[PDB]
Design an enzyme around this catalytic site. Structure first.
Site, PDB file in Angstrom:
ATOM      1  N   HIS A  87       0.945  -1.095   0.005  1.00 53.65           N
ATOM      2  CA  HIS A  87       0.238   0.087   0.106  1.00 53.65           C
ATOM      3  C   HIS A  87       0.862   1.223   0.096  1.00 53.65           C
ATOM      4  O   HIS A  87       1.983   1.290   0.368  1.00 53.65           O
ATOM      5  CB  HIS A  87      -0.803  -0.023   1.118  1.00 53.65           C
ATOM      6  CG  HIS A  87      -2.431  -1.040   0.901  1.00 53.65           C
ATOM      7  ND1 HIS A  87      -2.781  -1.536   2.101  1.00 53.65           N
ATOM      8  CD2 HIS A  87      -2.763  -1.701  -0.024  1.00 53.65           C
ATOM      9  CE1 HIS A  87      -3.804  -2.360   1.707  1.00 53.65           C
ATOM     10  NE2 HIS A  87      -3.774  -2.288   0.456  1.00 53.65           N
ATOM     11  N   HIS A 150      -3.660  -7.880   7.572  1.00 55.60           N
ATOM     12  CA  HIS A 150      -3.969  -6.614   6.976  1.00 55.60           C
ATOM     13  C   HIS A 150      -3.913  -6.766   5.235  1.00 55.60           C
ATOM     14  O   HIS A 150      -4.843  -6.045   4.421  1.00 55.60           O
ATOM     15  CB  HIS A 150      -3.235  -5.422   7.299  1.00 55.60           C
ATOM     16  CG  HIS A 150      -3.325  -4.227   6.694  1.00 55.60           C
ATOM     17  ND1 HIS A 150      -4.518  -3.250   6.755  1.00 55.60           N
ATOM     18  CD2 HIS A 150      -2.645  -3.766   5.676  1.00 55.60           C
ATOM     19  CE1 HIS A 150      -4.219  -2.538   6.017  1.00 55.60           C
ATOM     20  NE2 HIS A 150      -3.129  -2.529   5.239  1.00 55.60           N
ATOM     21  N   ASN A 181      -8.282   0.057   7.250  1.00 58.37           N
ATOM     22  CA  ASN A 181      -8.672  -0.334   5.806  1.00 58.37           C
ATOM     23  C   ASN A 181      -8.614  -1.766   5.489  1.00 58.37           C
ATOM     24  O   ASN A 181      -7.464  -2.158   5.560  1.00 58.37           O
ATOM     25  CB  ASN A 181      -7.981   0.634   4.709  1.00 58.37           C
ATOM     26  CG  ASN A 181      -8.315   0.571   3.518  1.00 58.37           C
ATOM     27  OD1 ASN A 181      -8.848  -0.420   2.897  1.00 58.37           O
ATOM     28  ND2 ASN A 181      -7.942   1.656   2.738  1.00 58.37           N
TER      29      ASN A 181
HETATM   30  C1  LIG Z   1      -4.688   1.666   1.611  1.00 56.19           C
HETATM   31  C2  LIG Z   1      -3.904   2.528   2.394  1.00 56.19           C
HETATM   32  C3  LIG Z   1      -2.883   3.640   1.638  1.00 56.19           C
HETATM   33  C4  LIG Z   1      -4.811   3.317   3.321  1.00 56.19           C
HETATM   34  C5  LIG Z   1      -5.718   4.700   3.036  1.00 56.19           C
HETATM   35  C6  LIG Z   1      -6.695   5.168   3.783  1.00 56.19           C
HETATM   36  C7  LIG Z   1      -6.817   4.629   4.990  1.00 56.19           C
HETATM   37  C8  LIG Z   1      -6.019   3.607   5.649  1.00 56.19           C
HETATM   38  C9  LIG Z   1      -6.024   2.805   6.838  1.00 56.19           C
HETATM   39  C10 LIG Z   1      -6.611   3.162   8.170  1.00 56.19           C
HETATM   40  C11 LIG Z   1      -7.947   3.455   8.158  1.00 56.19           C
HETATM   41  C12 LIG Z   1      -8.753   3.737   9.131  1.00 56.19           C
HETATM   42  C13 LIG Z   1      -7.931   3.717  10.585  1.00 56.19           C
HETATM   43  C14 LIG Z   1      -8.768   4.066  11.670  1.00 56.19           C
HETATM   44  N1  LIG Z   1      -9.953   4.760  11.540  1.00 56.19           N
HETATM   45  C15 LIG Z   1     -10.047   6.155  11.401  1.00 56.19           C
HETATM   46  O1  LIG Z   1      -9.226   6.890  11.231  1.00 56.19           O
HETATM   47  C16 LIG Z   1     -11.296   6.793  10.967  1.00 56.19           C
HETATM   48  N2  LIG Z   1     -11.249   8.445  10.957  1.00 56.19           N
HETATM   49  C17 LIG Z   1     -11.858   6.393   9.684  1.00 56.19           C
HETATM   50  O2  LIG Z   1     -12.413   4.999   9.856  1.00 56.19           O
HETATM   51  C18 LIG Z   1      -6.824   3.454  10.425  1.00 56.19           C
HETATM   52  F1  LIG Z   1      -6.190   3.203  11.687  1.00 56.19           F
HETATM   53  C19 LIG Z   1      -6.130   2.909   9.346  1.00 56.19           C
HETATM   54  C20 LIG Z   1      -5.059   1.850   6.578  1.00 56.19           C
HETATM   55  C21 LIG Z   1      -4.619   0.626   7.366  1.00 56.19           C
HETATM   56  O3  LIG Z   1      -5.671  -0.065   8.064  1.00 56.19           O
HETATM   57  O4  LIG Z   1      -3.615   0.218   7.419  1.00 56.19           O
HETATM   58  N3  LIG Z   1      -4.378   1.823   5.547  1.00 56.19           N
HETATM   59  C22 LIG Z   1      -5.047   3.149   4.764  1.00 56.19           C
HETATM   60 ZN   LIG Z   2      -2.181  -1.248   4.148  1.00 51.65          ZN
HETATM   61 ZN   LIG Z   3      -1.659   1.069   6.779  1.00 48.33          ZN
END
Ligand SMILES: CC(C)c1cccc2c(-c3ccc(CNC(=O)[C@@H](N)CO)c(F)c3)c(C(=O)O)[nH]c12
Ligand SMILES: [Zn+2]
Ligand SMILES: [Zn+2]
Length: 232
Positions: A87, A150, A181
């Protein structure tokens, strides 16, 4: 002023470092994605008179700012970088690194997925990580493939000198209420992969998530709990 940085304490376009242990720092940056703003972490590990970088700062400009912040705060050259999955929060910025003299590395799985996604692609392939439970040494760290979580390709990183476990995006922070995500996740395998981490690194003192605040070993069980409650 010493607390772990958050989006509210990082000026626009900027990166902060946080000292985790002797010779170990996290890096924190923020990025917008689909109209929301998120923090993300990576790791810096002292490697003699050089530095090993784990993960980009989520974008080209953020990653250039990361290099500048390292020069200001630490003053040792980054010579190698490892990206822990495909990612953009892990590989976006690899082209900046590559033009700054940093040798960039990832598993073959990560490289394939990055290429297929249209993301930046680390130069060098890390063999010996294709089966769950595999581990290899890389400078001052151990790289461990726990299984799909993940993402199918996610790696974790252990710093044996400090008992620091960098879980990356396979591990979530204690205040998390969601599994983040999950577009590329394996919710069914994720708990099993976390159990593997727990079994392999029972002496970890600090656990660092891909996004949010470090803590102790409890981040691992919390992660399993949140993923199970999401899948349900
Ligand atoms: C594909 C990659 C580039 C990407 C793009 C965009 C977001 C993510 C996240 C992500 C998303 C939400 C949370 C916690 N929730 C919030 O922050 C609330 N405001 C919204 O739900 C979090 F901790 C991480 C992760 C991940 O999970 O690794 N990867 C992401
Ligand atoms: Zn990721
Ligand atoms: Zn991430």
């Amino acid at each position: 002023s010493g607390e772990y940085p958050t989006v509210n304490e990082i000026p626009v376009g900027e990166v902060r470092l946080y000292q985790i242990a002797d010779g170990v720092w996290s890096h924190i940056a923020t990025q917008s994605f689909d109209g929301a703003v998120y923090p993300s972490n990576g790791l810096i590990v002292r490697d003699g008179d050089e530095l090993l970088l784990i993960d980009t700062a989520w974008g080209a400009k953020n990653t250039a700012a990361l290099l500048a912040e390292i020069e200001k705060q630490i003053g040792l050259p980054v010579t190698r970088a490892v990206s822990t999955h495909f990612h953009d929060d892990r590989v976006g910025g690899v082209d900046v690194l590559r033009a700054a003299g940093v040798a960039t590395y990832a598993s073959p799985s990560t490289r394939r997925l990055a290429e297929a996604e249209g993301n930046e692609i680390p130069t060098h392939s890390l063999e010996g990580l294709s089966s769950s439970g595999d581990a290899v040494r890389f400078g001052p760290v151990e790289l461990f493939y726990p299984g799909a979580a993940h993402s199918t390709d996610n790696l974790v990183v252990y710093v044996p000198s400090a008992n620091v476990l960098y879980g990356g995006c396979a591990v979530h922070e204690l205040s998390s209420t969601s599994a983040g995500n999950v577009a590329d996740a394996d919710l069914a395998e994720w708990p099993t992969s976390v159990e593997r981490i727990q079994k392999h690194y029972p002496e970890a003192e600090v656990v660092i998530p891909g996004h949010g605040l470090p803590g102790g070993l409890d981040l691992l069980q919390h992660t399993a709990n949140v993923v199970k409650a999401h899948k349900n």
